[PDB]
Amino acid sequence: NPEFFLYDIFLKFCLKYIDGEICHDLFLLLGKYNILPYDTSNDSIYACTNIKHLDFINPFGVAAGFDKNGVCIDSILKLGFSFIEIGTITPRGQTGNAKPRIFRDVESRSIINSCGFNNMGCDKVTENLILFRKRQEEDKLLSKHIVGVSIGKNKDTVNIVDDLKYCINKIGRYADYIAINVSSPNTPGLRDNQEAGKLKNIILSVKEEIDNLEKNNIMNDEFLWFNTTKKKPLVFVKLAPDLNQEQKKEIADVLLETNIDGMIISNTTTQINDIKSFENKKGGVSGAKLKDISTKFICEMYNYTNKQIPIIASGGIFSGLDALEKIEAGASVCQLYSCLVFNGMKSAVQIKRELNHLLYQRGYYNLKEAIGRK
Ligand SMILES: Cc1cc2nc3c(=O)[nH]c(=O)nc-3n(C[C@H](O)[C@H](O)[C@H](O)COP(=O)(O)O)c2cc1C
Ligand SMILES: Cc1c(C(=O)Nc2cc(Cl)cc(Cl)c2)cccc1[N+](=O)[O-]
Ligand SMILES: CCCCCCCCCCCC[N+](C)(C)[O-]
């Protein structure tokens, strides 16, 4: 397709000269105005997947942090993704840390960021999502597409749970699933909430508010859940890769105890010191250098949780091979971020194609058959 090619050229051009986050905001603006290309192709019936009763038309979505404020949901989805995770959002609008706060290393295909939860706040983003949902109702290309919402706490918030509860009550109705973000490295002391006790209490408080949305309501589910599933949002937790074996064991038990619907593995890491261009910069690292670390984390949690908790994969997914690696490791679905940064508009159509051809070679009937094979 020409359209993708022209954009890929324009993208590569902008990044040689212009600041990374400025380029991101520009392309979000292009998407907001619906000037981006569409992937109108039928997705392979053999590459569809699910997480419990949540159905994905294809196995690739966009990770949190990309469209933090959900100002670009239609256009990003129509690039060929089955879903997008907007946010992370916080109850109140927030600027984030000092710019510049995002840096790429092209040869390493890695990124580092210290954004610090910049977002327009829950109320504004909720209104954005509501507007998307009304558009989705009238757009052939948006049907069956999933939108999750990543939720977190404001910089100066002491009680994380109060912030999580607030977000759920505001935007929960419009979400297909909720992602509890306790793995950002750019909010001090946030990762401490991965402690078994705090985490368990966090998950239960979250599940409790979601359940309470349904009870206080008088309407049919048809009018209560203004989302894709027409059901209450599933609950996922996103984990950081920077833990020890024991911490991972402890968390796995809490996930089972609380009956969490899924786990996103994983967030950015801080253990990467091998990139010279990043030696003076603060933040969490993404991209190719994070792939092996993320994959191992998947195998471990898949094991610790006795294959009972569905897995959403994040970290260094660029190729169909990279994707199948996550899948054979235990993931049901994949999330992209770094891929779009380096491959551009074509990221979804390309990686879907590559994975389709690879499932055929390896003698898989469908995607679901490949989950957790290695
Ligand atoms: C600029 C930037 C912002 C991000 N913001 C969030 C976020 O708000 N919430 C979240 O859970 N993860 C966030 N992430 C982490 C990504 O969602 C993803 O998990 C990580 O980049 C690894 O995926 P990748 O290697 O394919 O890029 C962010 C990453 C980057 C680079
Ligand atoms: C360029 C960049 C991007 C990025 O590539 N964004 C983007 C890429 C595509 Cl292909 C489409 C849209 Cl709407 C946005 C995302 C986050 C950070 C950066 N960056 O700081 O370099
Ligand atoms: C230079 C102006 C004359 C041409 C008018 C603008 C052309 C835009 C049409 C793009 C259609 C793209 N589409 C929908 C096939 O993907």
Ligand SMILES: O=C(O)c1cc(=O)[nH]c(=O)[nH]1
């Ligand atoms: O907003 C951020 O700074 C951020 C959040 C997160 O979860 N992960 C990340 O790398 N950055």
